[PDB]
Amino acid sequence: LKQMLESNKDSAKLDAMKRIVGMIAKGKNASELFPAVVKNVASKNIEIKKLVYVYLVRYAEEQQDLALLSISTFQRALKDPNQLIRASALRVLSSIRVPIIVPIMMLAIKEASADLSPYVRKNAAHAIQKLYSLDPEQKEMLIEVIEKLLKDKSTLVAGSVVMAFEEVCPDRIDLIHKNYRKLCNLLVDVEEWGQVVIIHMLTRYARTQFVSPDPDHRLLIRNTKPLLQSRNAAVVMAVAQLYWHISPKSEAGIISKSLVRLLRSNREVQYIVLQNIATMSIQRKGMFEPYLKSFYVRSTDPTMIKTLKLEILTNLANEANISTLLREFQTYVKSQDKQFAAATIQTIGRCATNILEVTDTCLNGLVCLLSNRDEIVVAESVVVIKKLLQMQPAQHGEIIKHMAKLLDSITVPVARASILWLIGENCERVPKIAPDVLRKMAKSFTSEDDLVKLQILNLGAKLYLTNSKQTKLLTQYILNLGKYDQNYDIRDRTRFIRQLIVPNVKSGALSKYAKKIFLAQKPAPLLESPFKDRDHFQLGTLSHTLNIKATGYLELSNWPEVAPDPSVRN
Amino acid sequence: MIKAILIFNNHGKPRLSKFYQPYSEDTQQQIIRETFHLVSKRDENVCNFLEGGLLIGGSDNKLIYRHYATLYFVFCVDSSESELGILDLIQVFVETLDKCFENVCELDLIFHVDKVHNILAEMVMGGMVLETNMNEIVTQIDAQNKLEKSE
Amino acid sequence: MRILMVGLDAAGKTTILYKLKLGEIVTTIPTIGFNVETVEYKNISFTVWDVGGLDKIRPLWRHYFQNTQGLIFVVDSNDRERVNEAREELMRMLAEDELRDAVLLVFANKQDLPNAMNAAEITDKLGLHSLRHRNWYIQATCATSGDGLYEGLDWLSNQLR
Amino acid sequence: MIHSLFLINCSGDIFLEKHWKSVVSQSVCDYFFEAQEKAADVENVPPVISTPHHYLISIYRDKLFFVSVIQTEVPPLFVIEFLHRVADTFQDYFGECSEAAIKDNVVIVYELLEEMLDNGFPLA
Amino acid sequence: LQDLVRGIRNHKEDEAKYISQCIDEIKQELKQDNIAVKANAVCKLTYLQMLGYDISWAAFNIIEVMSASKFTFKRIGYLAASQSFHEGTDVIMLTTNQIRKDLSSPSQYDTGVALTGLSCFVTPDLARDLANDIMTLMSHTKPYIRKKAVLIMYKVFLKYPESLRPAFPRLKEKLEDPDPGVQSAAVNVICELARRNPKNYLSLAPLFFKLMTSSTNNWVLIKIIKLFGALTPLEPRLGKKLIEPLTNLIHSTSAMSLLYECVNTVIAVLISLSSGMPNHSASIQLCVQKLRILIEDSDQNLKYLGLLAMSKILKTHPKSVQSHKDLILQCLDDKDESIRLRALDLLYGMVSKKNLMEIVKKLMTHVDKAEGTTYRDELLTKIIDICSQSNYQYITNFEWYISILVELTRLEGTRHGHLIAAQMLDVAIRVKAIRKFAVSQMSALLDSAHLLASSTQRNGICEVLYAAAWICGEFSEHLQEPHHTLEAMLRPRVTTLPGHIQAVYVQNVVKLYASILQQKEQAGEAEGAQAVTQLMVDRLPQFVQSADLEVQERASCILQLVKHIQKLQAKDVPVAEEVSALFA
Numbered sequence A: 001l002k003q004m005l006e007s008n009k010d011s012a013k014l015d016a017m018k019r020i021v022g023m024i025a026k027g028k029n030a031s032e033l034f035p036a037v038v039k040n041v042a043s044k045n046i047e048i049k050k051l052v053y054v055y056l057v058r059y060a061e062e063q064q065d066l067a068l069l070s071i072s073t074f075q076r077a078l079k080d081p082n083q084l085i086r087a088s089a090l091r092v093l094s095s096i097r098v099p100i101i102v103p104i105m106m107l108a109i110k111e112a113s114a115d116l117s118p119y120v121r122k123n124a125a126h127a128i129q130k131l132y133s134l135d136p137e138q139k140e141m142l143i144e145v146i147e148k149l150l151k152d153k154s155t156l157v158a159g160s161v162v163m164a165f166e167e168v169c170p171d172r173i174d175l176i177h178k179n180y181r182k183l184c185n186l187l188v189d190v191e192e193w194g195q196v197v198i199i200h201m202l203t204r205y206a207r208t209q210f211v212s213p214d215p216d217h218r219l220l221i222r223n224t225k226p227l228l229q230s231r232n233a234a235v236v237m238a239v240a241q242l243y244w245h246i247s248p249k250s251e252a253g254i255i256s257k258s259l260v261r262l263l264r265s266n267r268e269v270q271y272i273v274l275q276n277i278a279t280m281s282i283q284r285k286g287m288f289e290p291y292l293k294s295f296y297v298r299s300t301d302p303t304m305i306k307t308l309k310l311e312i313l314t315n316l317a318n319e320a321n322i323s324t325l326l327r328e329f330q331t332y333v334k335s336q337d338k339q340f341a342a343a344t345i346q347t348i349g350r351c352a353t354n355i356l357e358v359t360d361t362c363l364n365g366l367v368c369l370l371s372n373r374d375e376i377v378v379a380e381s382v383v384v385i386k387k388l389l390q391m392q393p394a395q396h397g398e399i400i401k402h403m404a405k406l407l408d409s410i411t412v413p414v415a416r417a418s419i420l421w422l423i424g425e426n427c428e429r430v431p432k433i434a435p436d437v438l439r440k441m442a443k444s445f446t447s448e449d450d451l452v453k454l455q456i457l458n459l460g461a462k463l464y465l466t467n468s469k470q471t472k473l474l475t476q477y478i479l480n481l482g483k484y485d486q487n488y489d490i491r492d493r494t495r496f497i498r499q500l501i502v503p504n505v506k507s508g509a510l511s512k513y514a515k516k517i518f519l520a521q522k523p524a525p526l527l528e529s530p531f532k533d534r535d536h537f538q539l540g541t542l543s544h545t546l547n548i549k550a551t552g553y554l555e556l557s558n559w560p561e562v563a564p565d566p567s568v569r570n
Numbered sequence B: 001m002i003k004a005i006l007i008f009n010n011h012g013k014p015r016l017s018k019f020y021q022p023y024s025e026d027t028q029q030q031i032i033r034e035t036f037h038l039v040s041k042r043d044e045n046v047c048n049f050l051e052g053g054l055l056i057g058g059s060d061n062k063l064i065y066r067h068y069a070t071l072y073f074v075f076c077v078d079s080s081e082s083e084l085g086i087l088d089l090i091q092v093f094v095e096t097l098d099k100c101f102e103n104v105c106e107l108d109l110i111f112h113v114d115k116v117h118n119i120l121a122e123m124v125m126g127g128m129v130l131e132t133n134m135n136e137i138v139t140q141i142d143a144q145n146k147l148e149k150s151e
Numbered sequence C: 001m002r003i004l005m006v007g008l009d010a011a012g013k014t015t016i017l018y019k020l021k022l023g024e025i026v027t028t029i030p031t032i033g034f035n036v037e038t039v040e041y042k043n044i045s046f047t048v049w050d051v052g053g054l055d056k057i058r059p060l061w062r063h064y065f066q067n068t069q070g071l072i073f074v075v076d077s078n079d080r081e082r083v084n085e086a087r088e089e090l091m092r093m094l095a096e097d098e099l100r101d102a103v104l105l106v107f108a109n110k111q112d113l114p115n116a117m118n119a120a121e122i123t124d125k126l127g128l129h130s131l132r133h134r135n136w137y138i139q140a141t142c143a144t145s146g147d148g149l150y151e152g153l154d155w156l157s158n159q160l161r
Numbered sequence D: 001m002i003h004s005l006f007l008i009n010c011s012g013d014i015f016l017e018k019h020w021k022s023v024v025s026q027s028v029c030d031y032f033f034e035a036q037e038k039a040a041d042v043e044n045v046p047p048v049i050s051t052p053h054h055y056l057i058s059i060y061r062d063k064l065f066f067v068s069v070i071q072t073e074v075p076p077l078f079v080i081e082f083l084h085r086v087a088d089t090f091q092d093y094f095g096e097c098s099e100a101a102i103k104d105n106v107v108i109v110y111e112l113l114e115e116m117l118d119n120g121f122p123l124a
Numbered sequence E: 001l002q003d004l005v006r007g008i009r010n011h012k013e014d015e016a017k018y019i020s021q022c023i024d025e026i027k028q029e030l031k032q033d034n035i036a037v038k039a040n041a042v043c044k045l046t047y048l049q050m051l052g053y054d055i056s057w058a059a060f061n062i063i064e065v066m067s068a069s070k071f072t073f074k075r076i077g078y079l080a081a082s083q084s085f086h087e088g089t090d091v092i093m094l095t096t097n098q099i100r101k102d103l104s105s106p107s108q109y110d111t112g113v114a115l116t117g118l119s120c121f122v123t124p125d126l127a128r129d130l131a132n133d134i135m136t137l138m139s140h141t142k143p144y145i146r147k148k149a150v151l152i153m154y155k156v157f158l159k160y161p162e163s164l165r166p167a168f169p170r171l172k173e174k175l176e177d178p179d180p181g182v183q184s185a186a187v188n189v190i191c192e193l194a195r196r197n198p199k200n201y202l203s204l205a206p207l208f209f210k211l212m213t214s215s216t217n218n219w220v221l222i223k224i225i226k227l228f229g230a231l232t233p234l235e236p237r238l239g240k241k242l243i244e245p246l247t248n249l250i251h252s253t254s255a256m257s258l259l260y261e262c263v264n265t266v267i268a269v270l271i272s273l274s275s276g277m278p279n280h281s282a283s284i285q286l287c288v289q290k291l292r293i294l295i296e297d298s299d300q301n302l303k304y305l306g307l308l309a310m311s312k313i314l315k316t317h318p319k320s321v322q323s324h325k326d327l328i329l330q331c332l333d334d335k336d337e338s339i340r341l342r343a344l345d346l347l348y349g350m351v352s353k354k355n356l357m358e359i360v361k362k363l364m365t366h367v368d369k370a371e372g373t374t375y376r377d378e379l380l381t382k383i384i385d386i387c388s389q390s391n392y393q394y395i396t397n398f399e400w401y402i403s404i405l406v407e408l409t410r411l412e413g414t415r416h417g418h419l420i421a422a423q424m425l426d427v428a429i430r431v432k433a434i435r436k437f438a439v440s441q442m443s444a445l446l447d448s449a450h451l452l453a454s455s456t457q458r459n460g461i462c463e464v465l466y467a468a469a470w471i472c473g474e475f476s477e478h479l480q481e482p483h484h485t486l487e488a489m490l491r492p493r494v495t496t497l498p499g500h501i502q503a504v505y506v507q508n509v510v511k512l513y514a515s516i517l518q519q520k521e522q523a524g525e526a527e528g529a530q531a532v533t534q535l536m537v538d539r540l541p542q543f544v545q546s547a548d549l550e551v552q553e554r555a556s557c558i559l560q561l562v563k564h565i566q567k568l569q570a571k572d573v574p575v576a577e578e579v580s581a582l583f584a
């Protein structure tokens, strides 16, 4: 496709540009024809100029040396009276990664910042963040350019300026310490993406510089109020997560109306808000108490969005409505969505721990579930039951005996593991059922999963401690089977439990102590919703939705004691 | 033997399709679409040797092609065919079309497709190639055209 | 003038076609598809379609009914065993609406053979006298000697001109 | 912010590719493909996927996926809603969101993504 | 025909209705008396078949069209008939009269068009009925007729071998056809006949020898040499005869594609001849040089095929393949993934004790440049294969191996994280000498385990944390800061990791307790031991409070163990020996 590139007719060049645009769209290497395109950089055709400049943007990092050869055209194009051409040329020179060009881009960015066009100014903010990605050492004149840019009144430039300021200099707070009032005044009219960025950075500044709820506190809250009704979920979300961290607890409850309203949005947006609501519902349960019904699971939602609603229902669970939710949850148990049932069964287990009054009432429902045929449901039922028998360590013989026989039809490793621990823990409560189950699994040992093999070795040792009279040989066999296993997690069990159990030759005081530590009352597992771990992070970020402080996290501090002088603010 | 002859543009619109195996019309369209999807996504720097799909009789057969302008000339061949032989056969076909249609393009393949079938016929006939020396091919072609103009 | 020439295999159709066209007796094999020639007689041109009569391919006769103006039905006059089958095939064809206006020339062929049924006998065997609203003629012929052929054509030319 | 966008068809291949910053191969879509494989269906893909140097924010609507590349920490629903507004822009221009329309008007598509997204930061 | 194309172009979204109307129009036109309009409808029917519409409804109409005396309409009829008739359409029995008329006619062009049509009518019945005529036509006066006829009898050989039985001597005699194109077609016919039952064509090898020697047409050369490669397994001596003319052609070859095809066949012939006569390494080296000439070609097809051929000679004779070196690792940079992965396979074939270092280093540079979970996945997988091939046979500096596995740990999102952990476990358990460097690196990982916690997905980096925490615990005697590592791996950050990782972490907590308790009591530092026990009596509960089963069991048992051991220590009991024996 060279010929029509050096062909004089401009239409041929335009066709070649469109076709190479498609070529890049298909992800194909068109870098070889770079010299012909860059030879067309001096075109007077605006469309051809745009296309060749997009080509330069896409293939600048590939043919770096050839682009370096043609820089003079780029500095000449920086003066083109067309604003878009100026921005694109600035982008092109930014994309070039030669360590020597740096001062040229100094002059380019300072001119662009001095440019009257706001578009060029925001692209100059993009240029300075690109430079900081290129050279950290130029941060001084980077900061002075930031100081010049932050003074501009336009919101269009303001959003990009704030984003760049966050990208390069999160620490030099004084620049915003001079312009917080300008930012909050503009935030009424700032564009929605700029709304989000400015709201987050203002959240940082409020956490770092201000003390406990100051008229400036209300000024943010007063101006942020009309945005609760905004069509943008991000504005509503950011405004909502703003009030969670700055607004008084007696006023933050108002945003719950909009958060529920956001749940009618599409799948992805409602996915994030469910994470936000679930985290913030733990600390203030009564806030979403009036909207318990809206959090009821609909069959139309997919698996994980349904799962998130259940977790919120766990937080909203209380003695005044435990009965209402338990009935509704039982309805969801026999849903066709097997994965949702796995979430639902775990959901009822947690609130059962939360409400000690309904321990048996939830328990009575569970045992009926043990009779159903669905392998996943019966597997997930037994583990949820297992958490409940430990917390209420009563001799529930009527419950274990139904559970104990059910093992022979169970295939799931988690469920098969669940059977072994309780019967071992309750070996003295069902002494006529425990001995055969160990005998049953001992012959099949080599076929079970690793996690099950851990508990089956546990079952023997606990059975050996209490009823060695008739199970000693079974323990000997089950120990010897794990002695030559392949998988390694089990080997620690072979090393650990055996030494506590078998070698009475070196029987110290701790060897005597093995019987009590294995038969000790196991404390109730403090079940935690996977959202209290998000209490360390501001609401509505990746670090919120990923639960990890990844590269670039905008971490908030604790609330300081004494207010730094608000008089400087004027 | 070659199993099938496939020609289509970069958009998947067929331009020449003649088959030497019994395949149904829907099977023909499915073969064309499978070949287009298998081929057109590949780079310009890729080898033009793509293992064939299931619509063309199994994995033994292969899809081999060349791209000129916006046209893909795919020959469905078996494992006994010389793949570079098939490529240069496609090249001979391209140059023969160039000479006979006087700088052929996609327009001639659209608007003179029966002529293209005839050209294919003297190049390859019954899964077996008939004539391959471009000059003598052109002599036979314009001898047939002299016949046509004669009556 | 479009003429369809049909009749059982071995009747002499192909022999007749080439005797009419070429004035010679040609060696034949059973015709798998068809033969076609245009014959000019007394300044009228007849396109004669000689379509194979083997039983297996008799279904294909129907492909030639459309626009046919004249039917030549050739019978082996010596083949008594199959004369009723010939009648059946003739009547099956004459039942077709497409042929309702076609004129019918029957060649009672192979009159050279000593046990050949004559035109009067073949008329009876084919049930020709029962036909209604049909222009028909039967002509005794020996295709190999040419006897009777031009007389058949005289009638057919008169019908169509 | 959004340094690249990867459209992916129902078959699980690179339907379209565009960049605004340093180019990252179409390859980063392989984490999204793995997520789909582990997902029960096209409605079981988590919007957030982490990669060694980038992050994958994806939305699903109109039988197409909008896979985006995120390098550093910036809010998620921001990216999700911008992706959905870009899809709404496809619907506004084409009249429908489909593979064929984009395959036909790739050039106008890149014009629109240039208009909406400038050097990673959405603004229009 | 052209009007149909224009209408279809105009009726893009309305293609179905317009095509149905045109089909009705074609139905009307094909029953007309004029052959011209029905033949134009035949053109439109062929175009419709190209689009995907059933053309078989007008088989009798096509037969009517081809019945025309004019060749201008014969060509259209026979084209649509080649594209239309099938074995399941008995209407083809109506074609016989016209087929015989055009087959027996002396005209050249009509016969050519007729035989072109016959190229797709090739049924057992028509073969049985037309073999007698085609065998008369075999020696037809005109050469062009013979040229088409030899392919048509090939089709007949496919559908009627009863005429194959006598034609084989006749085709062998045809192999002396004076016209070069007819001779080329005859060679193609006899060669593709040979492809199915090559044993009957071994005696024809001298004929093919003379054909290739006298041939100036590279096409006959390529195909006949391919058939030589096909027959090469049957008689190696014929390939030995061929090797000299083949080498001469290679020297005189100017077509790189012919060069590839012939050299590949020569490699096959060398495979056949290597069975007892191992003195053709000179020809092997000539082949290698030609493969190099091919590989430096900028044409990517030539390049990939050269790679495949040198892979074949790699499984044949790697001793000359190793000469490539840079010639492959440079190609590693190419934009084609298939070529690149074949090149990686070539490096796998190229692995040796003396070059593992450099090649693996360059592949690490590529993994740092790598892109794609399937790409990087198979890449690291085959890196693991080549380093672990024959149980780490090619590895000399196992410290380098541990470091490069650590570098691999930087690869987030990899699905073989379990495999990577297995590799570090293997190198730790197998090699005693490098356990110190292993435990140092793994304790370093544990120190940065807060950063490594970013990948909680199963078979991810958590498996690396698994292996690291383990071989830190098992080989704790070589640790330099056991207290620091222990405190760092009791940090509350670990509570977010998946189950068995947390379980094995606690299992290593108790190991580190045993080691440090022995260390403190051996020197008499009772107060430090009391302090550390007080630490884990304040730390193990955060494991006890978890939800994962094995975590609960392990944490409860070890918490009771540690607290009541503290009770024992209040009685001044040397519990260090017992706790050490717990894991000896």
Ligand SMILES: Nc1nc2c(ncn2[C@@H]2O[C@H](COP(=O)(O)OP(=O)(O)OP(=O)(O)O)[C@@H](O)[C@H]2O)c(=O)[nH]1
Pocket: C007, C008, C009, C010, C011, C012, C013, C014, C015, C016, C028, C029, C030, C031, C032, C051, C052, C053, C054, C074, C109, C110, C111, C112, C113, C141, C142, C143, C144, C145
């Ligand atoms: N004795 C005698 N034999 C005849 C006469 N006419 C035709 N034949 C012979 O009858 C045989 C069959 O003649 P064809 O013309 O092939 O019969 P057909 O009706 O064309 O048969 P199909 O092709 O099967 O439809 C040949 O051996 C002819 O020579 C005749 O008038 N007298």
Ligand SMILES: [Mg+2]
Pocket: C013, C014, C015, C028, C029, C030, C031, C052, C053
């Ligand atoms: Mg006959």
